[PDB]
Amino acid sequence: SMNNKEVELYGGAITTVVPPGFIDASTLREVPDTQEVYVNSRRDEEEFEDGLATNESIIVDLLETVDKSDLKEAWQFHVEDLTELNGTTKWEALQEDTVQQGTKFTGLVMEVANKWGKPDLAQTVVIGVALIRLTQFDTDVVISINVPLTKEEASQASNKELPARCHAVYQLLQEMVRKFHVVDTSLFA
Question: Are strands 139-148 and 57-64 parallel, antiparallel or unpaired?
Fold first, then answer.
């Protein structure tokens, strides 16, 4: 099972949870104004029952609402923005779920093609992506959790198997969405 702890985001205007051993990256380096970034800082020695390893990273980003009324289409639009950064030309959803009609959607995504034509030129990365639409405040919250796969997990990935750690990351992602709370709406314009 997981044992995530509550954290305050954006000066306390928002709360959610992250796993123990995950550090707020802003304590060491400036991060974009609309983002909160947490990276796994666990030593290889310590081993929780989280199912997590030591290299995942979590990003919460407050973005403008995308002009797509459909929840899945909006989620896909935001996934595309994250993947296109990596040179990704085609991606696949290993898992997807409408958590709440019209407002919360989550999934696990993976690149299957890139602009250089070398899908397996380097290590595979699975990204958990959630969209929380705060329609009232014109903001699409996008939470992404990067999962750089080991050689074995990648072999599973393209044998249509879902690595155990990816299942654990999805449970963390859904819990972050489940415990997401806007405590102070004066954060938005």
Answer: antiparallel
Residue in the block written with tokens 């397996």: 120
Q: What was the structure determination method?
A: X-ray
Q: H or E segment at 71?
A: helix 71-83
Residue 186: closest CA among 8, 6, 7, 12: 12
CATH of domain 1-189: 3.40.1000.10
Domain definitions of the chain by residue range: 1-189
Resolution value (Å, 1 decimal): 1.9
SS (H, E, C) 131-183: EEEEHHHCEEEEEEEEEECCHHHHHHHCCCCCCHHHHHHHHHHHHHHHCCEEC
Separation CA 113–CA 104 (nearest Å): 27
